Ligand binder design. Structure first.
Ligand SMILES: CCCCCCCCCCCCCCCCCC(=O)OC[C@H](COP(=O)([O-])OCC(O)COP(=O)([O-])OC[C@@H](COC(=O)CCCCCCCCCCCCCCCCC)OC(=O)CCCCCCCCCCCCCCCCC)OC(=O)CCCCCCCCCCCCCCCCC
Ligand SMILES: CCCCCCCCCCCCCCCCCC(=O)OC[C@H](COP(=O)([O-])OCC(O)COP(=O)([O-])OC[C@@H](COC(=O)CCCCCCCCCCCCCCCCC)OC(=O)CCCCCCCCCCCCCCCCC)OC(=O)CCCCCCCCCCCCCCCCC
Ligand SMILES: CCCCCCCCCCCCCCCCCC(=O)OC[C@H](COP(=O)([O-])OCC[N+](C)(C)C)OC(=O)CCCCCCCCCCCCCCCCC
Ligand SMILES: CCCCCCCCCCCCCCCCCC(=O)OC[C@H](COP(=O)([O-])OCC[N+](C)(C)C)OC(=O)CCCCCCCCCCCCCCCCC
Ligand SMILES: CCCCCCCCCCCCCCCCCC(=O)OC[C@H](COP(=O)([O-])OCC[N+](C)(C)C)OC(=O)CCCCCCCCCCCCCCCCC
Ligand SMILES: CCCCCCCCCCCCCCCCCC(=O)OC[C@H](COP(=O)([O-])OCC[N+](C)(C)C)OC(=O)CCCCCCCCCCCCCCCCC
Ligand SMILES: CCCCCCCCCCCCCCCCCC(=O)OC[C@H](COP(=O)([O-])OCC[N+](C)(C)C)OC(=O)CCCCCCCCCCCCCCCCC
Ligand SMILES: COC1=C(OC)C(=O)C(C/C=C(\C)CC/C=C(\C)CC/C=C(\C)CC/C=C(/C)CC/C=C(/C)CC/C=C(\C)CC/C=C(\C)CCC=C(C)C)=C(C)C1=O
Ligand SMILES: CCCCCCCCCCCCCCCCCC(=O)OC[C@H](COP(=O)(O)OCCN)OC(=O)CCCCCCCCCCCCCCCCC
Ligand SMILES: Nc1ncnc2c1ncn2[C@@H]1O[C@H](COP(=O)(O)OP(=O)(O)OP(=O)(O)O)[C@@H](O)[C@H]1O
Ligand code: CUA
Lengths: 98, 125, 78, 104, 52, 49, 51, 62, 251, 110, 130, 222, 50
């Protein structure tokens, strides 16, 4: 990586900035190979959180009205059952005639 | 009538009565001319209706708007020359007699020359 | 959308209003709205069940519904 | 944007024919591409072609407000270079042209 | 001026013939001539030939 | 001072916040599926904003 | 507060450091981009530390 | 054939219940829908009286 | 100027309306399409009526919150007010919204509570902006639907302002003489506050904004019950009128 | 690079502005659209949807797909014509649309 | 850019619907849409009982002391009684309606009892975790 | 075998299921093990989401107010104003709970593509108002005679310039529209048509669209 | 791409005017019909206009 790919390493060092920081540039790899892991894993967690949030937004947008309509229909069905019982009672009352 | 019906009727009548209230306001410095008479107005409308009757079949048969636009532009150029003549004659007219003479000349010129020109151009199309 | 939890109110006046609306709706629907004027509120019908579970259970109960019908007929006659 | 391909080059000869049919600044090319997509796999069938035409009708109706019978009473179904998708009739005509240009 | 008779909508055979003609024209188009696909491509090419 | 604290402080803080505070979730909400998600810490407080 | 539906979108505290809200899609995208911006400085930071 | 798609056209009800009457009515080739799919999304032109008269005079194909 | 000439010949525009594929829109009584019109001038020395303003806008004025000296009780009078107003009082009450979302009759002095909270409210070091809205209170919050595009046309009366909503991250510069159009899309149900982000003068600091994006059903309810009636209040205003309008236009 | 960009900006925006400065009798709208197409359809603010997965997650991708379809539904839009299609599935993983073009509405992707 | 986010959670699936009679409701709604009845109340499975007049007169509201000024076919759609065509195409959808009503009645009949012990931790069974 | 009239509605058929047995439909639907929990959650969510109104112990009615911030709702619940009776989401008690989309667009006479590059739309507003005024100069005085503004509203015809008017209104802000309306009033009072003043076509450069045969210039194809 | 270039495709139009020192929101009359003609999503992702 870097100077090793060049067969004139002196030219590689001279033509960029005429400066030598190769020691630090090549000793930084050891630290950089592990300095990133906590950030990477926390970023994975945060990306999963964002994905869950997007899925929840989609599900709400698509199904919230459907759930509300289902609940409304359920309550209407309860009223329908009560109405059928009331009609039976009214028919019995008409037939008897207290 | 209901309140809504009354409001709608009031709005319609008020919208129609704009000229009623606009008449009362007039300007002193104004080159007032003699308006064209009702008889001449009706005669010119009848001439225009005759031209429209002559033009109706060809334009209805035509399916592209470009040809209709060309016919309209040519007829409008002719009628606009005649309209300018009528306007300059009537504006200077000093009496209803002169106004009627100008209107009669304009309508006769339509009925003859404009009819012939419309027939010619329609046959060309 | 975050919606906060709240159990049925069971407020006395609110449930009385909802029960009156339900009774009116039942009376009209029994005759199929063959009345001079209509006073049905299906939205309030839904809210009755949503807010007053106790009265809904009473109405579902065969004995409770019978008693309610008898009381309603007595009140209408008187 | 509403077509079936990421870029016009992905589309076959139908997209090139649409580009030739309409001028480069005329957005009826997109409607022609929609017609191509509708006609894919249907032009070579007598019923498929009619189905594609009905799909064009539905597409125009959903794109613009339209009344019943306008598309049936359209006088000329031909399209010229400077025809734009400003009306349901123009959208329908462009879609039909795309269906015609579609080969397979 | 006067309008010509508008032919009825083409059948599938007419569509195929038109597609073949368009393909032939595209193939005939020279490679070194850079003209975009558009309604005015052929007119532009004729103008360019006259200009040359 | 330079590397380990700077590259691990925010992540440690977010992890502890999720552990001990439910990432600041406001409870009393219904139907988590429909409810919005209270994200974990994402703005680096240690980095210059 | 539209009934029991809490429509309030910002619950920032006195010492807020982040965005006022994260419900908006634009703000979510900006926050994600800002968080991942600092992830790509590991080699540079290590090199500067060594220097 | 592989790339052929319906693109949302004529996406009417597709019955799943075995005994739904639609599952046989749609199979029946001589089945007329209440309105054509393209017209289902277009504004009505007939007046209310005309529409009511047409619906009253309408006769089921069977 | 120059006087209206006695007669004008006007070409009827063609192709403006594409409905039903009809080039001609004017047909004479005899059944022939009209290509030209004759317009005649009478009473030349006459005024010309001004164009009638046929633009109807439902206008909401969002201004900073105004302090209340006294919390007036809710009073409702009898209907059928054929006169200027009915002196008789039907109902008078002091409702307050309890934690149970019920408007219960208050057993305290509302004005006293208002004064006490105004003077010596309890705050904290970490208090949410939701519970601390000191400089973010207005009236007539702007209600929009959610999950749909809206075209916002921004402008100013006097000088340049900035409509700023940090919650949505939306900043629109309202400049005089411009009609800048913006696309507005809130992908969630939420209530957002905002401030002005452009120096304007005396009350640049105090000029808040409140925008509530709600599900379309709630937005439509709010529209029908608050905004639509005002759009005809300019001419017709009554409870029966509002009922008629809401029954006539039902979604 | 800056000079080439400025030259392109000039060609698209500055010189064409002077082509039309008065009402035109014939094909006024056609000529106005001709001069406006080159400026309003620049790739800088059009290209990118082909690689939308770089910023849009699967669920976010589906939501933004429906949003973009709604936004660009208008037929008269050269920018929409030049924009990449929204009728496609997220390359990584798709959760909403199983097959492209199998919808219940020609406009709504679902 | 290419992998600026550095990770994508493809595992997180689209949350699955868990409502009792959602499929039945959607089937009935699709059948009604195919029927193409201008009235909207038909969306409710118990419309013939909730609005009995919809089959005889169509007057669902009492227009007393309130003007009634229709302007087109879209003004008072709920005031028009169902015609023969609409009645036929709704009868063609009775099987779905019966199933939907049966599911609703079963859900109503089901009631909470002390026997249930996982009620508090029902979210896991509802699959709210991802 | 089917009776050859399967699906036909019996004469006099009534949409009533008063005495129907629902046991035969048990096998046609599937309920998950947490059906009771789902029912309770649905009820809770509907109650806490759809209820934007509050019952009042004084008027025995439901009242509501415009949306307010949490601070106003909480710390000023005792100080509320503009309470209005709750009229219901729909007149007939149906449900407005639906997911909405974008309606089909309106056909355009003056395309926005003329000046779509500019976000200000001032040029587009000017052009649209100019076209609307061109139509108005023709149709303005007949509006009360043979158009929507007739007293007999039964036989009314829409104003021809309605679409141009609405497009101009959309493109123009109210203040600019007022300026242009003042200009339109002045121009109508002067009775000035752009045609009788226009002479810039002589100085405009030629183009293929200026060919003397405009009808024949266009080429049509299928 | 999401928050711009979509003026032509909007449900309705609202005019925001800024004055010294308040705001004014105007809804044009066409917004009433635009809201009245909003499509409804019913069934398995089907769209209806009433
Ligand atoms: C305030 C404080 C805090 C900070 C705040 C924030 C500050 C923000 C500031 C922002 C500023 C922005 C700008 C930042 C940039 C600044 C740069 C600057 O100013 O300095 C200029 C600085 C000048 O250059 P340089 O960095 O000094 O150049 C030195 C090279 O980088 C170094 O490399 P080199 O080639 O010169 O020397 C190394 C080479 C030299 O060593 C050699 O001799 C090569 C030997 C190769 C063979 C190895 C294996 C041999 C095995 C033999 C057998 C073994 C025994 C048997 C075992 C068998 C079984 C085990 O050896 C290697 O390490 C190469 C190994 C290859 C790696 C891949 C191998 C994978 C396979 C595994 C193989 C090995 C393990 C397996 C072993 C066996 C397993 C079986 O950088 C630049 O030139 C410009 C940098 C611009 C960025 C882009 C650069 C891209 C080009 C590449 C360079 C990338 C690295 C350098 C990047 C810079 C940072 C580190
Ligand atoms: C007689 C002679 C006189 C002298 C003559 C002198 C002049 C002529 C000289 C020679 C001939 C040159 C001809 C040039 C083109 C002529 C015009 C033409 O063809 O018609 C237009 C035609 C328009 O494009 P199109 O065909 O419609 O394609 C777009 C469709 O979307 C379809 O797109 P697609 O998906 O199919 O792929 C297209 C993609 C093709 O892919 C690439 O370009 C790849 C580039 C990487 C290098 C590729 C190297 C070759 C392939 C790899 C190697 C071979 C394979 C592997 C071999 C391995 C063997 C071991 O290329 C692009 O166009 C992508 C960039 C366009 C958008 C960005 C524009 C720049 C604004 C700044 C960016 C920010 C906005 C966007 C944000 C996006 C975020 C998601 O071509 C173009 O001009 C396209 C653009 C060409 C490049 C310029 C624009 C991008 C430049 C970016 C880098 C430079 C910096 C930018 C400035 C600001 C920086 C801060
Ligand atoms: C982040 C992970 C890494 C991703 C890979 C990124 C690199 C991709 C490959 C780029 C190749 C093209 C480079 C163009 C610039 C060349 C400039 C130059 O002077 O070259 C002439 C040089 C000439 O060198 P020379 O020494 O023979 O001669 C020059 C000296 N005089 C003048 C005296 C003759 O040719 C090369 O050596 C080419 C090297 C190409 C590799 C890049 C070198 C820079 C350091 C990074 C190494 C990356 C290795 C990647 C391996 C593959 C991975 C997929
Ligand atoms: C100040 C001195 C000015 C002197 C000159 C003024 C007189 C007019 C000169 C006109 C020259 C026209 C040359 C056209 C060349 C076309 C070449 C070609 O094939 O292109 C094809 C392209 C694309 O068309 P095409 O490719 O579809 O056409 C096919 C072309 N052939 C036949 C070759 C295959 O043409 C164009 O894009 C049109 C012309 C573009 C011109 C761009 C000008 C850029 C100007 C930058 C700003 C300069 C500001 C200066 C300010 C000065 C202030 C003092
Ligand atoms: C060449 C000069 C370059 C200078 C570059 C600029 C450098 C800027 C950064 C400087 C940082 C200095 C050190 C700060 C340490 C802060 C530790 C802390 O509170 O935890 C933060 C973080 C914050 O996480 P948290 O979990 O505590 O809280 C997060 C916040 N909430 C909960 C609200 C969400 O915690 C940790 O890192 C926990 C482990 C800490 C282990 C190390 C403790 C060190 C204690 C101080 C040093 C020892 C005392 C004697 C020092 C004598 C010195 C001579
Ligand atoms: C001719 C021009 C090039 C062709 C056009 C390329 C356009 C498309 C790509 C542009 C954006 C590239 C960056 C993507 C996001 C990642 C950024 C990043 O890691 O930077 C931090 C890094 C350095 O920061 P770092 O040290 O923190 O890197 C991460 C370290 N770990 C893994 C430990 C977490 O940037 C660099 O200095 C290296 C170059 C960028 C990474 C390249 C990886 C190889 C991919 C091939 C590159 C060659 C071009 C082809 C690209 C592939 C598609 C064609
Ligand atoms: C010596 C090698 C020569 C290599 C050949 C290429 C270089 C030729 C000389 C320089 C000019 C390059 C112009 C390329 C683009 C031409 C067309 C154009 O502008 O429109 C396309 C695009 C514009 O596309 P658009 O948005 O107008 O799209 C048109 C199509 N519609 C309307 C449908 C969308 O141009 C740009 O975006 C320009 C951006 C500025 C940066 C351009 C960099 C070009 C590549 C690097 C060149 C480096 C040259 C170095 C020379 C010296 C060293 C050797
Ligand atoms: C990866 O790790 C990294 C990060 O992640 C955390 C980074 O963020 C960063 C980014 C950081 C930076 C660019 C640097 C940011 C800045 C930093 C760290 C410096 C901050 C310093 C401070 C907050 C302290 C300020 C200093 C002070 C002296 C303040 C005063 C304090 C004290 C105790 C003294 C008080 C005294 C007085 C007020 C005066 C009293 C006395 C007198 C008047 C004198 C009177 C005279 C007589 C004679 C008696 C980097 C570089 C990094 O590597
Ligand atoms: C004071 C400083 C001292 C020095 C530093 C010491 C460390 C201090 C603590 C750092 C911060 C840790 C906590 C915050 C980051 C981790 C967050 C985390 O783990 O989040 C969860 C995430 C995956 O979970 P997810 O699926 O997204 O969410 C649902 C969870 N059921 O998790 C993941 O991404 C999965 C992780 C799996 C286990 C990884 C084990 C790594 C082992 C490394 C070995 C050595 C290095 C090897 C490197 C190889 C590559 C080069
Ligand atoms: N009144 C209009 N309403 C809508 N679009 C129009 C109108 N006038 C013109 N256009 C648009 O401008 C294009 C060119 O208009 P032009 O007047 O040349 O058309 P035409 O001759 O009537 O026939 P065609 O519709 O076939 O182009 C039309 O295709 C249409 O895209
Ligand atoms: Cu208004 Cu600053």
């Amino acid at each position: 990586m870097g100077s090793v790919w060049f067969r004139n390493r002196y030219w590689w060092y001279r033509s960029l900035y005429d400066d030598y920081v190769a020691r630090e540039a090549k000793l930084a790899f050891g630290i950089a190979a592990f300095i990133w892991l906590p950030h990477y894993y926390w970023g994975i967690h945060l990306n999963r959180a964002f994905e869950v949030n997007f899925s929840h937004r989609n599900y709400a947008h698509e199904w919230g009205p459907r759930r509300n309509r289902l609940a409304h229909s359920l309550e209407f069905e309860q009223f329908d059952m009560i109405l059928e019982n009331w009609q039976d009672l009214e028919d019995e009352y008409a037939q008897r005639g207290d | 009538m209901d309140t809504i019906q009354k409001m709608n009727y009031e709005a319609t009548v008020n919208m129609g009565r704009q000229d009623l209230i606009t008449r009362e306001y007039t300007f002193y410095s104004d080159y007032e001319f003699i308006p064209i008479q009702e008889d001449r107005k009706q005669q010119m409308e009848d001439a225009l209706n005759n031209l429209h009757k002559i033009i109706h079949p060809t334009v209805t048969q035509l399916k592209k708007k470009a040809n209709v636009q060309e016919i309209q532009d040519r007829v409008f150029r002719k009628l606009q020359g005649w309209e300018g003549e009528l306007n300059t004659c009537v504006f200077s007219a000093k009496n209803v007699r002169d106004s009627n003479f100008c209107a009669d000349r304009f309508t006769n010129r339509i009925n003859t020359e404009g009819v012939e020109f419309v027939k010619q151009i329609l046959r060309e199309y | 959308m975050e919606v906060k939890y709240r159990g049925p109110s069971d407020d006395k006046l609110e449930c009385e209003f909802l029960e009156n609306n339900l009774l009116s709706c039942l009376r009209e629907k029994s005759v199929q709205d063959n009345v001079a004027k209509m006073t049905c509120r299906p939205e309030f019908l839904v809210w009755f069940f949503l807010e007053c579970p106790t009265k809904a259970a009473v109405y579902h109960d065969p004995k409770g519904l019978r008693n309610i019908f008898i009381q309603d007929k007595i009140k209408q006659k008187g | 944007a509403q077509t079936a391909h990421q870029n016009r080059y992905q589309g076959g000869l139908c997209y090139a024919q649409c580009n030739e049919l309409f001028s480069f600044w005329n957005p009826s090319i997109q409607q022609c591409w929609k017609g191509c997509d509708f006609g894919v796999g249907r032009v070579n069938d007598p019923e498929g072609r009619i189905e594609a035409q009905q799909m064009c009708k539905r597409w125009a109706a959903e794109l613009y407000w339209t009344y019943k019978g306008e598309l049936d009473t359209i006088k000329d179904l031909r399209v010229h270079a400077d025809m734009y998708p400003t009306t349901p009739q123009n959208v329908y005509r462009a879609c039909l042209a795309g269906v015609r240009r579609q080969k397979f | 001026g006067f309008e010509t008779v508008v032919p009825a909508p083409p059948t599938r055979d007419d569509e195929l013939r038109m597609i073949k003609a368009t393909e032939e024209q595209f193939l005939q188009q020279p490679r070194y001539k850079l003209y975009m696909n558009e309604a005015h491509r052929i007119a532009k090419m004729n103008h360019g030939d006259r200009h040359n | 001072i330079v590397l380990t604290w700077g590259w691990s402080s925010f992540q440690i803080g977010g992890y502890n916040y999720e552990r001990f505070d439910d990432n600041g979730e406001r409870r009393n909400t219904l139907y988590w599926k429909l409810s919005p998600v209270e994200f974990p810490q994402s703005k680096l407080w240690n980095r210059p904003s | 507060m539209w009934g029991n539906l809490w429509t309030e979108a910002s619950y920032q505290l006195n010492f807020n450091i982040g965005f006022s809200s994260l419900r908006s899609d634009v703000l979510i995208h900006l926050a994600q981009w800002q968080y991942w911006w600092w992830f790509w400085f590991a080699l540079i930071w290590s090199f500067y530390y060594f220097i | 054939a592989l790339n052929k798609r319906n693109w949302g056209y004529n996406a009417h009800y597709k019955p799943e219940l075995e005994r739904s009457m639609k599952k046989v009515l749609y199979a029946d080739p001589n089945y007329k829908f209440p309105i054509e799919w393209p017209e289902r999304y277009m504004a009505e032109t007939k007046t209310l009286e005309q529409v009511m008269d047409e619906e009253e005079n309408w006769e089921y194909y069977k | 100027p120059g006087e209206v000439l006695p007669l004008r010949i006007i070409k009827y525009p063609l192709g403006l309306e594409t409905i039903h594929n009809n080039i001609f829109e004017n047909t004479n009584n005899e059944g022939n399409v009209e290509l030209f019109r004759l317009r005649f001038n009478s009473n030349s020395s006459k005024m010309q009526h001004k164009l009638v303003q046929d633009t109807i806008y439902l206008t909401l004025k969002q201004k900073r919150y105004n302090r209340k000296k006294v919390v007036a009780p809710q009073i409702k009078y009898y209907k059928d007010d054929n006169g200027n107003k009915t002196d008789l009082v039907k109902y008078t009450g002091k409702p307050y919204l309890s934690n149970d979302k019920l408007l219960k009759q208050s057993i305290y002095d509302q004005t006293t509570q208002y004064k006490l909270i105004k003077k010596n409210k309890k705050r904290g070091e970490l208090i949410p902006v939701t519970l601390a809205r000191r400089i973010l209170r207005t009236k007539k919050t702007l209600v929009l639907p959610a999950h749909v595009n809206i075209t916002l046309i921004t402008n100013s009366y006097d000088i340049v302002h900035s409509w700023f909503i940090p919650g949505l991250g939306i900043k629109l510069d309202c400049v005089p003489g411009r009609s800048t159009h913006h696309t507005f899309f809130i992908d969630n149900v939420g209530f957002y506050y905002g401030q002005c982000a452009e120096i304007c003068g005396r009350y640049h600091h105090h000029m808040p904004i409140r925008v509530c994006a709600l599900p379309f059903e709630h937005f439509l309810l709010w529209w029908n019950t608050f905004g639509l009636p005002k759009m005809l209040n300019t001419v017709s205003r009554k409870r029966f009128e509002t009922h008629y309008e809401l029954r006539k236009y039902s979604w | 690079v800056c000079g080439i960009y400025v030259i392109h900006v000039i060609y698209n925006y500055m010189i064409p502005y002077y082509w039309v400065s008065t009402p035109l009798k014939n094909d006024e709208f056609t000529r106005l659209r001709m001069k406006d197409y080159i400026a309003s359809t620049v790739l800088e603010e059009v290209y990118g949807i082909s690689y939308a997965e770089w910023g849009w997650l699967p669920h976010d991708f589906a939501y933004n797909r429906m949003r973009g379809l709604a936004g660009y539904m208008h037929p008269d839009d050269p920018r929409a014509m030049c924009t990449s299609t929204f009728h496609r599935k997220h390359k990584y993983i798709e959760h909403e649309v199983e097959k492209v073009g199998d919808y219940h509405h020609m406009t709504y992707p679902k | 850019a290419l992998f600026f986010m550095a990770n994508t959670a493809i595992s997180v699936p689209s949350v699955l619907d868990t409502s009792p009679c959602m499929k039945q409701m959607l089937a009935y709604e699709d059948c009604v849409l195919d029927a193409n009845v201008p009235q909207q109340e038909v969306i409710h499975p118990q419309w013939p009982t909730i609005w009995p007049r919809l089959l005889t007169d169509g007057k669902l509201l009492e227009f007393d002391k309130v003007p009634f000024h229709p302007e087109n076919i879209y003004n008072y759609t709920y005031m028009r009684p169902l015609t023969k065509k609409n009645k036929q195409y709704l009868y063609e959808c009775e099987e779905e309606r019966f199933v939907f009503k049966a599911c609703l009645r079963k859900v109503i009949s089901l009631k909470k009892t002390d026997k249930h012990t996982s009620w508090d931790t029902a979210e896991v069974a509802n699959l709210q975790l991802t | 075998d089917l009776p050859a009239d399967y699906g036909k509605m019996p004469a006099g058929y009534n949409f009533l299921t008063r005495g129907k047995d629902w046991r035969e439909y048990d096998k046609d639907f599937i309920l998950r093990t947490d059906a009771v929990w789902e029912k309770f959650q649905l009820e809770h969510f509907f109650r806490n989401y759809m209820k934007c109104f509050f019952f009042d112990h004084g008027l025995k009615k439901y009242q509501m107010f415009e949306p307010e911030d949490m601070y106003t709702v909480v710390f000023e619940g005792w100080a509320l104003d503009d309470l209005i009776t709750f009229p219901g989401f729909t007149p007939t008690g149906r449900t407005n709970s639906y997911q909405i989309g974008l309606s089909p667009r309106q056909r355009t006479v003056v395309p926005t593509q003329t000046f779509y590059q500019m976000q200000d739309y001032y040029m587009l507003c000017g052009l649209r108002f100019e076209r609307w005024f061109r139509c108005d100069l023709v149709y303005h005085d007949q509006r009360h005679t043979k158009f929507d503004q007739v007293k007999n509203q039964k036989n009314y015809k829409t104003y021809p310039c309605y679409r141009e008017y609405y497009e101009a209104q959309y493109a123009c802000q109210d203040d600019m529209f007022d300026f242009l309306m003042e200009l339109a009033y002045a121009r109508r009072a002067a009775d000035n048509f752009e045609s009788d003043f226009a002479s810039h076509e002589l100085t405009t450069l030629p183009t293929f669209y200026d060919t003397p045969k405009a009808a024949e210039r266009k080429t049509y194809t299928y | 791409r999401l928050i711009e270039w979509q003026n032509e495709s909007s449900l309705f139009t609202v005019r925001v005017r800024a004055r010294q020192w308040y705001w004014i929101y105007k809804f044009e009359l066409k917004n009433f019909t635009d809201i009245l003609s909003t499509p409804k999503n019913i069934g398995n992702n089907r769209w209806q206009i009433n």
